[PDB]
Amino acid sequence: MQEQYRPEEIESKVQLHWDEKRTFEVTEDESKEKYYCLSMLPYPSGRLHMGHVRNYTIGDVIARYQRMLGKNVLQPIGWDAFGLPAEGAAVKNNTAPAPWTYDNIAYMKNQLKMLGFGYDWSRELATCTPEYYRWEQKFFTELYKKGLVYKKTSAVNWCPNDQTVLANEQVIDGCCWRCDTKVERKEIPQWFIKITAYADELLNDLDKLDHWPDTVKTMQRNWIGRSEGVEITFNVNDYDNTLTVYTTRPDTFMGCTYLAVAAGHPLAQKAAENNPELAAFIDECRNTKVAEAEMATMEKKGVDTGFKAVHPLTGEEIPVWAANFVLMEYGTGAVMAVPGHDQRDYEFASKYGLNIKPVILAADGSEPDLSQQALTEKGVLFNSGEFNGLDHEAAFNAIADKLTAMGVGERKVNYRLRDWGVSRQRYWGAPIPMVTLEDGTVMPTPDDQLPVILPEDVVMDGITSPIKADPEWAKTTVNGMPALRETDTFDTFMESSWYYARYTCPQYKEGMLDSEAANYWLPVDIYIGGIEHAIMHLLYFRFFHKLMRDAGMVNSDEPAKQLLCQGMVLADAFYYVGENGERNWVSPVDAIVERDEKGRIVKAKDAAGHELVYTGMSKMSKSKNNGIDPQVMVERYGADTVRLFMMFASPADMTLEWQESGVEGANRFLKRVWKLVYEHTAKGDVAALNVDALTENQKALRRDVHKTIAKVTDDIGRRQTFNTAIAAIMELMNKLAKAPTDGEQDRALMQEALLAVVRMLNPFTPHICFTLWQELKGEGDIDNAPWPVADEKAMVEDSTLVVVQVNGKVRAKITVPVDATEEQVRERAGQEHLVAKYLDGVTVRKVIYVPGKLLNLVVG
RNA sequence: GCCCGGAUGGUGGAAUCGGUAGACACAAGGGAUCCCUCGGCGUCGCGCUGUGCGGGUUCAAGUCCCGCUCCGGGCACCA
Ligand SMILES: CC(C)[C@@H](O)[C@H](O)C(=O)NP(=O)(O)OC[C@@H]1C[C@H](O)[C@H](n2cnc3c(N)ncnc32)O1
Ligand SMILES: [Mg+2]
Ligand SMILES: [Mg+2]
Ligand SMILES: [Mg+2]
Ligand SMILES: [Mg+2]
Numbered sequence: 008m009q010e011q012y013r014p015e016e017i018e019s020k021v022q023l024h025w026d027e028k029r030t031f032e033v034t035e036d037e038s039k040e041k042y043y044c045l046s047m048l049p050y051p052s053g054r055l056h057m058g059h060v061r062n063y064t065i066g067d068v069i070a071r072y073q074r075m076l077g078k079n080v081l082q083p084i085g086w087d088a089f090g091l092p093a094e095g096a097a098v099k100n101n102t103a104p105a106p107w108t109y110d111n112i113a114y115m116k117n118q119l120k121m122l123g124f125g126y127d128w129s130r131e132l133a134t135c136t137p138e139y140y141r142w143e144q145k146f147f148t149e150l151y152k153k154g155l156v157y158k159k160t161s162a163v164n165w166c167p168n169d170q171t172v173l174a175n176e177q178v179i180d181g182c183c184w185r186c187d188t189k190v191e192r193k194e195i196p197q198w199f200i201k202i203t204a205y206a207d208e209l210l211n212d213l214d215k216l217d218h219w220p221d222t223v224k225t226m227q228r229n230w231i232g233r234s235e236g237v238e239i240t241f242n243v244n245d246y247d248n249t250l251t252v253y254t255t256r257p258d259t260f261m262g263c264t265y266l267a268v269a270a271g272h273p274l275a276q277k278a279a280e281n282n283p284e285l286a287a288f289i290d291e292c293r294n295t296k297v298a299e300a301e302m303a304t305m306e307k308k309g310v311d312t313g314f315k316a317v318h319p320l321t322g323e324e325i326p327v328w329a330a331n332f333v334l335m336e337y338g339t340g341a342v343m344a345v346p347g348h349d350q351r352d353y354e355f356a357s358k359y360g361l362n363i364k365p366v367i368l369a370a371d372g373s374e375p376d377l378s379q380q381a382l383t384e385k386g387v388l389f390n391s392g393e394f395n396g397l398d399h400e401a402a403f404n405a406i407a408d409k410l411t412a413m414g415v416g417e418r419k420v421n422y423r424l425r426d427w428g429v430s431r432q433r434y435w436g437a438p439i440p441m442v443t444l445e446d447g448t449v450m451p452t453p454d455d456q457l458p459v460i461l462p463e464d465v466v467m468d469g470i471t472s473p474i475k476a477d478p479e480w481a482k483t484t485v486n487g488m489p490a491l492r493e494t495d496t497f498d499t500f501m502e503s504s505w506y507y508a509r510y511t512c513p514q515y516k517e518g519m520l521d522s523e524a525a526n527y528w529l530p531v532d533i534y535i536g537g538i539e540h541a542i543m544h545l546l547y548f549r550f551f552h553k554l555m556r557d558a559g560m561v562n563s564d565e566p567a568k569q570l571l572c573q574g575m576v577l578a579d580a581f582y583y584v585g586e587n588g589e590r591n592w593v594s595p596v597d598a599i600v601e602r603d604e605k606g607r608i609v610k611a612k613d614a615a616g617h618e619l620v621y622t623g624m625s626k627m628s629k630s631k632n633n634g635i636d637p638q639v640m641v642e643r644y645g646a647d648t649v650r651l652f653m654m655f656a657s658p659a660d661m662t663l664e665w666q667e668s669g670v671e672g673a674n675r676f677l678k679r680v681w682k683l684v685y686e687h688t689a690k691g692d693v694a695a696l697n698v699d700a701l702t703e704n705q706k707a708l709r710r711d712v713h714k715t716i717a718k719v720t721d722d723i724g725r726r727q728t729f730n731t732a733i734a735a736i737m738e739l740m741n742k743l744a745k746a747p748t749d750g751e752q753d754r755a756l757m758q759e760a761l762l763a764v765v766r767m768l769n770p771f772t773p774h775i776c777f778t779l780w781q782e783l784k785g786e787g788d789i790d791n792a793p794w795p796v797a798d799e800k801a802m803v804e805d806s807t808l809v810v811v812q813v814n815g816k817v818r819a820k821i822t823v824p825v826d827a828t829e830e831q832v833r834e835r836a837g838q839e840h841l842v843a844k845y846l847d848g849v850t851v852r853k854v855i856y857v858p859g860k861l862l863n864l865v866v867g
Numbered sequence: 868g869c870c871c872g873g874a875u876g877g878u879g880g881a882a883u884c885g886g887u888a889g890a891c892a893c894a895a896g897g898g899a900u901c902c903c904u905c906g907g908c909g910u911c912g913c914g915c916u917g918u919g920c921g922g923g924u925u926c927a928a929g930u931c932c933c934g935c936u937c938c939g940g941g942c943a944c945c946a
């Protein structure tokens with residue numbers, strides 16, 4: 008053993024050993040309890056960043072821990088390889104997306120290997136390969152045939168010049184990120200999967216997920232947004248079509264004083280034929296961008312349509328207004344307004360002079376003051392004809408029943424959750440296996456024509472997808488007739504929704520899943536990812552799991568028993584605007600920055616002299632060029648130091664503002680462990696430890712080793728606070744460095760301790776541990792060593808520390824036999840001069856005794 | 868705007884079930900790879916104060932409640 012710890016002479020040697028022994032390659036071994044430890048697969052943007060490093064270290068820590076408990080652990084890795092970033096990057100770099108992606112995969116695979124994550128490389132998948140996506144295509148066709156897929160018109164950001172569909176990220180201030188002109192909404196026919204058919208199940212099964220955090224379960228409930236209400240239909244006077252609204256507040260219905268209607272509503276359109284203010288307004292609205300955040304912050308605006316709906320119950324004509332905040336796609340395109348009791352409606356009505364009609368009494372039974380704002384509280388009705396005096400429940404029911412009897416209303420369940428738009432009009436994605444025949448009929452691509460392969464050998468131009476530009480490509484024949492294949496491609500969450508199941512049988516050719524292998528490994532025991540994916544991805548993932556259950560592909564109702572959503576790793580993000588409009592994102596490594604007394608960035612320049620817009624600390628990201636690559640730290644300090652640092656900096660669930668400073672802590676600590684092992688083992692073999700004949704000083708030390716094993720075990724296995732586990736190991740290491748090591752018992756004890764420390768560290772820093780384990784003459788390779796177990800007999804204590812407070816303020820700390828009464832603790836407490844000092848002249852009014860821990864004498 | 872989080876020393880963080888605030892480290896300063904000091908203010912072998920800010924509940928709040936400021940995640944085409 009070398010005196011000096013040299014990660015360059017260790018890490019690659021140990022990685023080579025795992026590659027060659029196939030250490031982490033697993034099969035469906037029925038002799039072992041499985042454990043499936045899954046980390047959210049990487050998108051191959053080119054480099055890892057520290058967000059990746061935290062995700063996969065947490066996951067590797069757990070997979071190694073579970074292996075040491077004797078489990079057969081599948082920890083798989085793969086690439087979520089389709090998507091937008093490959094398209095811009097290929098244009099700019101004069102490549103195609105495929106070759107760019109596969110190069111990023113190779114680079115990034117090498118970085119993963121160099122961090123030493125124990126992945127089963129034999130199960131490596133890339134989602135952009137037809138061996139993968141053929142299965143989701145077949146599955147889609149089966150989903151369409153079972154009536155779970157439909158086509159409708161949906162809004163897309165449209166650049167009228169380039170004639171491109173843009174993602175929201177590419178829309179910058181309602182103008183493009185290429186040339187400059189106003190992006191507009193274009194309604195476009197697209198495919199949707201009826202995730203709403205599973206809304207209730209998705210909502211309800213949250214109650215089974217006892218090992219998913221409440222943050223994620225609440226965000227998902229609120230996203231699905233299930234509601235119980237009433238749909239109501241209105242006639243409109245010089246108009247041949249009815250108008251339907253949904254409300255969850257039918258009780259306030261007599262207070263409905265106007266309807267609002269989406270700029271694109273046929274009623275608005277008709278009215279626009281005879282009204283120039285209106286026409287101009289509808290046309291302003293085509294440049295309302297599709298993004299809920301923008302819908303909800305924009306100044307709310309309306310023009311009167313001149314049409315009047317008839318309130319079904321009161322009979323009065325109420326105005327129909329066209330509004331910039333109501334969308335045709337997200338319901339019936341019409342909403343009803345109750346400005347007396349909805350603050351948003353109140354604001355609109357105040358702005359426009361519409362009737363604000365009160366129908367709920369104030370808390371005292373008087374008519375409410377609506378001069379400043381709405382009375383939003385549920386209450387007793389008045390000014391509501393036959394419904395006066397009813398409360399919320401009863402008014403809901405009475406008004407619902409009446410409208411139903413009249414044939415203009417029905418009780419309806421509503422969800423905020425919309426169906427899943429899975430169409431994209433980009434090239435770099437899996438082709439949607441649908442076809443239009445010469446006939447005009449549309450159908451799934453026939454089975455013998457699956458997969459529909461995306462050609463990878465392409466010339467890109469940024470504007471048009473090659474499969475859309477090549478005329479021949481879409482041509483096929485179906486039912487003996489000419490047909491055109493769909494040139495849209497799948498939303499990439501399609502591939503990431505089922506990868507976890509495909510990792511169980513990635514080389515299986517006869518079907519999407521080998522259910523035998525799927526049912527050995529599933530469900531995922533723990534799914535490690537960022538909080539970023541708490542909603543969209545996790546919901547889609549749960550849904551897809553239920554879809555496959557309903558195809559009889561899987562046993563479980565849910566895909567993942569436990570979920571560990573780490574906080575995001577953040578880094579400062581910067582950009583300057585390029586001379587033709589476009590944001591150029593500069594790495595924080597390259598920004599020159601001046602800082603506040605509070606640490607806040609206050610000026611920011613790139614080295615080229617550009618003035619950088621500082622956007623804040625935000626998730627390390629492919630898109631914002633703010634991802635910090637670990638390569639240089641791994642090369643300087645070693646993978647083990649980087650991994651320990653990441654696990655040490657913060658507990659997984661906190662969000663982390665990345666900084667390199669602090670690494671010296673991990674690195675120096677690893678050098679101390681190395682030194683201690685070196686010094687111990689330079690001395691040779693140890694005698695068997697004689698427990699019954701230990702000193703008190705030796706007993707004490709042995710207690711702390713075992714107390715450290717128990718705590719570390721709890722911290723990793725129950726709390727997932729890795730940072731505190733590592734701190735416990737450091738504390739123990741600090742005691743062990745001051746332990747004498749002359750005698751045989753002292754050395755026997757140090758052997759036991761070090762064998763314990765090196766195993767407890769192995770998940771975090773496995774290359775050094777693998778090596779040290781050998782120096783200690785541990786049995787076998789550490790990857791297979793049992794996790795140390797604490798012995799209860801070694802950690803008994805007859806004494807306990809009691810803090811003594813007077814009036815909540817610590818005045819003494821005393822040691823107290825564990826059998827001590829309160830009365831004896833009092834007396835012992837009285838013996839301390841700093842307790843007597845605050846008791847002289849006063850009366851103890853109340854004693855609080857937390858047995859074995861605290862005495863608060865409340866005095867005066 | 869809406870949903871979910873968050874704020875503890877110069878810095879990352881610890882306090883797990885309401886019970887010693889600042890473990891463990893980094894950085895910096897001092898002393899000889901190691902030891903020391905290290906929130907702030909002032910009988911220091913003492914005392915007061917202090918967990919973003921404003922209030923509550925409680926013998927007791929970093930923890931629970933209400934509110935405010937600032938900050939992150941998501942908001943359906945970033946993945
Ligand atoms: C499962 C699927 C939808 C995702 O995995 C998607 O392919 C993706 O996001 N890939 P990624 O950005 O490479 O990052 C891979 C994972 C996702 C997870 O949130 C984590 N991650 C990504 N970025 C961060 C980050 N900044 N902080 C903390 N964690 C981060 O690594
Ligand atoms: Mg902090
Ligand atoms: Mg602070
Ligand atoms: Mg306390
Ligand atoms: Mg102090």
Ligand SMILES: [Mg+2]
Nearest residue numbers: 917918919920
């Ligand atoms: Mg405070």
Ligand SMILES: [Zn+2]
Nearest residue numbers: 166183186188
């Ligand atoms: Zn443009």
